[PDB]
Ligand binder design. Structure first.
Ligand SMILES: Nc1ncnc2ncn([C@H]3O[C@H](COP(=O)(O)O)[C@@H](O)[C@H]3O)c12
Ligand SMILES: Nc1ncnc2ncn([C@H]3O[C@H](COP(=O)(O)O)[C@@H](O)[C@H]3O)c12
Ligand SMILES: O=C(O)c1cccnc1
Ligand SMILES: O=C(O)c1cccnc1
Lengths: 349, 350
């Protein structure tokens, strides 16, 4: 039907009828101000993480007059996430780990300062502290299931860097937030940063994150470990970015990862992206469920949604994973498309 | 039962066996740095709201070297709140509505800017927006019971100003965070602010808050209404400050008080404060439960706790209300005193 499952291993039955909390962890990356690594449109990238979570939580962007778009003009995947929050009454609370511009909605502040210059190997100096903060926050969140997404423009580059720094075969395998995927530029950036920071086989996961990660990653790892340690399921709601978070979790607490309570929840558009290879990254990390939602956007009435099928946007803001939860719990998939179609005119003017 | 109850109305049964979320809403008031209205010690007042929630959430204050103290040197009531969250495994997540210096723990940011000059009638310009933010946040907090506290040094003064601005008889009835309760100074501050802002019987509740409230108040009112509207109980965990919040709630949504889902949870020290009159404020607002926890601090080894019985500190950081929840759910009250005594050296090196 409307969920594509790889290595499902009973995970879907652990989430049917369970009470979720959705949280999106946001960050900005200083590199994106000067180097065109991101597929988010340059005119909105500084405002995109906060505008995304404003749309999800409040129903419209406040930091921008219309919600964000990718380079090809397709709408933010926060449109999908908002549709699911409304259609399934999903409680949502969002976390800042360094957006350039902060949300105008209530939000959880973990670190005001953006992710740094990846090409200098100076992403952050505090990845262990951010992990600890995500874990301690997670212990105070009460839900039966955590659905944790991201909005980090540039985050497919940091995902590549972290996977490479940990020793995985990831060149050419990470996705992009738009149709074009400038792999040569991304490799140049992360290889430079890994070299400058002296990353090698002996480096710890926190050294790798400090060099070329983004600040969302340790926070999400902490939240996820806090839930799985308590025997609660977690959907890492994202694409190849969440494969990097999964690799980080394996380095921090493999025993918790081995409980089989953590899955990747993404979209059909990422799973079927021929310019990357999500399934192939995950195979290197472990036997972890990969679940992808189908949207039937080929027959959407919004051209920008039809363009997801060509590679525009694909994923983000937890869209794929929140849709997996929603569809497993009985939401008819075309209700997502119809919701967006209904709200699109007022959102985009 | 170690609980003093006024107009209980069966509320104690609504909180027994329910899973709580504890949240402390923090703010700072610009007036407190210029005029000595607060009972929090002037050396630490700027840092107190954030140090309080750091103690509760993490177990250590992180900018201050030790936790806060009142003007007499007695320990912050966050000691009680920390004891309860540990002893009863209470989940907690704290909210900033304008502390001067922010927490170093994760926290929910609602408004970074402090509450302004009460004596100028310029507390804030955005009470309506702050109410809506607390309301929408509350819809996204999943708990069976909300325990909502505050840490707002100077908050007994803004409580007096809001109560007077709404037309209550409140002079001499608000409490104080230390032994001295400077009623004549407080009344001058708030009546000057009310006059400057032009507040009268035609003003809205948001006009009153914009003149002389603190930013915690509309946030808490929104949180509380969001829960009670959903048929869930709320403990307003504070003293005379929460009576002002209750009056705000009545102005915004009086019918929600008819559900009997909102109670004030405070300490014996506030209820029995002979320099204030909590019961006499609440009687003017409505038939709302007022529940007060007993601590048996007369028998403590630490002078700082014994001083609560003489009027030091009294309440704050949700201590009274979280203790009401804990005692109703079978916590032996003296385990609080004992926990504090056991950690006092780690916290204060005394
Ligand atoms: N693609 C997107 N388009 C419009 N709005 C978006 N908000 C998030 N994303 C998504 O794309 C970004 C990652 O892709 P890259 O590495 O190319 O920047 C993240 O922000 C992700 O959430 C968006
Ligand atoms: N009294 C206190 N002493 C030490 N630390 C405190 N933290 C909060 N309070 C408490 O006292 C303050 C209100 O009293 P006033 O209007 O006199 O300032 C609030 O901060 C309240 O939480 C404290
Ligand atoms: O692979 C990802 O994580 C991804 C792809 C497209 C857009 N946002 C994220
Ligand atoms: O009356 C109050 O609200 C109060 C009294 C003392 C300390 N904190 C609050």
């Amino acid at each position: 039907m409307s969920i594509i499952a790889i290595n499902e291993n009973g995970f879907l039955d652990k989430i049917k009828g369970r009470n979720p909390l959705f949280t999106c962890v946001i960050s900005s990356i200083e590199t994106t101000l000067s180097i065109p690594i991101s597929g988010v449109h340059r005119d909105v990238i500084k405002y995109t993480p906060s505008a995304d979570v404003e749309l999800v939580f409040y129903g419209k962007s406040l930091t921008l007059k219309t919600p964000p778009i990718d380079a090809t003009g397709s709408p933010t995947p926060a449109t999908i996430t908002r549709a699911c929050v409304e259609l399934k009454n999903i409680k949502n609370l969002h976390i800042d780990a360094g957006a350039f511009v902060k949300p105008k909605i209530p939000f959880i502040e973990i670190d005001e300062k953006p992710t740094g210059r990846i090409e200098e190997g100076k992403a952050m100096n505090n990845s262990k502290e951010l992990y600890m903060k995500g874990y301690l926050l997670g212990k105070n969140l009460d839900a039966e299931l955590l659905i944790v997404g991201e909005s980090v423009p540039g985050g497919t580059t940091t995902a590549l860097g972290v996977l490479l720094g940990l020793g995985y075969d990831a060149e050419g395998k990470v996705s992009s937030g738009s149709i074009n995927n400038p792999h040569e530029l991304k490799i140049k950036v992360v290889r430079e940063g890994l070299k400058k920071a002296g990353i090698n086989e002996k480096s710890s996961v926190f050294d790798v994150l400090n060099a070329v990660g983004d600040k969302m990653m340790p926070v999400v790892a902490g939240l996820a470990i806090s839930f799985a340690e308590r025997n609660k399921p977690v959907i890492l709601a994202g694409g190849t970015q969440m494969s990097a978070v999964l690799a980080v979790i394996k380095e921090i607490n493999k025993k918790v990862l081995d409980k089989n309570l953590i899955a990747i929840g993404t979209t059909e558009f990422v799973l079927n992206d021929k310019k990357g290879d999500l399934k192939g990254i995950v195979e290197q990390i472990g036997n972890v469920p990969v679940l992808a939602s189908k949207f039937y956007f080929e027959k959407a009435k919004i051209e920008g949604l039809k363009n997801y099928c060509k590679g525009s946007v694909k994923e983000g803001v937890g869209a794929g994973g929140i849709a997996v939860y929603s569809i497993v719990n009985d939401l008819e998939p075309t209700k997502i498309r119809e919701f967006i179609e209904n709200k699109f005119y007022e959102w985009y003017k």
